[PDB]
Amino acid sequence: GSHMASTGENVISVAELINAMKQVKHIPESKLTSLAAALDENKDGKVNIDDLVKVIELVDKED
Protein backbone atom coordinates (compact mmCIF):
# COMPACT_ATOMS: atom_id res chain seq x y z
CA GLY A 1 0.00 0.00 0.00
CA SER A 2 1.64 3.15 1.22
CA HIS A 3 5.23 2.46 0.33
CA MET A 4 6.28 4.73 -2.51
CA ALA A 5 7.08 8.46 -2.15
CA SER A 6 7.09 8.13 1.61
CA THR A 7 9.37 11.17 1.53
CA GLY A 8 6.10 13.17 1.32
CA GLU A 9 7.02 14.30 -2.11
CA ASN A 10 4.70 15.48 -4.90
CA VAL A 11 3.33 13.42 -7.77
CA ILE A 12 3.34 13.83 -11.54
CA SER A 13 1.61 11.72 -14.12
CA VAL A 14 3.16 9.11 -16.50
CA ALA A 15 2.24 11.10 -19.61
CA GLU A 16 3.45 14.37 -18.16
CA LEU A 17 6.65 12.70 -17.03
CA ILE A 18 7.33 11.21 -20.47
CA ASN A 19 6.33 14.57 -22.00
CA ALA A 20 8.62 16.59 -19.75
CA MET A 21 11.57 14.31 -20.46
CA LYS A 22 10.56 14.23 -24.13
CA GLN A 23 10.90 18.02 -24.37
CA VAL A 24 13.60 18.75 -21.76
CA LYS A 25 15.74 15.92 -23.00
CA HIS A 26 15.65 13.78 -26.13
CA ILE A 27 15.87 10.30 -24.82
CA PRO A 28 13.98 7.28 -26.37
CA GLU A 29 10.39 7.81 -25.20
CA SER A 30 9.93 4.03 -25.03
CA LYS A 31 12.18 4.01 -21.95
CA LEU A 32 10.43 7.09 -20.62
CA THR A 33 6.97 5.57 -20.66
CA SER A 34 8.24 2.15 -19.54
CA LEU A 35 10.10 3.66 -16.56
CA ALA A 36 7.14 5.82 -15.62
CA ALA A 37 4.86 2.78 -15.84
CA ALA A 38 7.39 0.79 -13.76
CA LEU A 39 7.45 3.50 -11.11
CA ASP A 40 3.72 3.58 -11.30
CA GLU A 41 3.02 1.17 -8.63
CA ASN A 42 -0.75 1.41 -9.01
CA LYS A 43 -0.47 1.39 -12.77
CA ASP A 44 -2.88 4.34 -12.60
CA GLY A 45 -1.01 6.65 -14.90
CA LYS A 46 0.26 8.77 -12.08
CA VAL A 47 3.84 8.53 -10.70
CA ASN A 48 5.36 10.15 -7.70
CA ILE A 49 7.95 12.85 -8.47
CA ASP A 50 9.94 11.22 -5.67
CA ASP A 51 10.24 8.24 -7.94
CA LEU A 52 11.83 10.22 -10.61
CA VAL A 53 14.31 11.80 -8.27
CA LYS A 54 15.11 8.46 -6.52
CA VAL A 55 15.46 6.57 -9.74
CA ILE A 56 17.85 9.23 -10.97
CA GLU A 57 19.73 9.06 -7.64
CA LEU A 58 19.89 5.28 -8.05
CA VAL A 59 20.86 5.57 -11.76
CA ASP A 60 23.42 8.19 -10.61
CA LYS A 61 25.19 5.48 -8.70
CA GLU A 62 28.21 4.40 -10.73
CA ASP A 63 29.07 0.73 -11.00
Annotated binding-site residue? 54: no
Position 63 contacts Ca ion (CB under 5 A):
no
What is the rounded distance in angstroms from the CA atom of residue 63 to the CA atom of residue 55? 15
CB of 12 to Ca ion, least distance (A): 10
Helix ranges, the chain (H): 14-24, 29-39, 49-60
Using the rule CB under 5 A, which residue among 3, 8, 23, 44 binds Ca ion? 44
Name the phi and psi angles at 29, rounded to 5.
-50, -25
Q: Which residues are annotated as a binding site for Ca(2+)?
A: 40, 42, 44, 46, 51
Residue ranges binding Ca ion (CB under 5 A): 40, 42, 44, 46
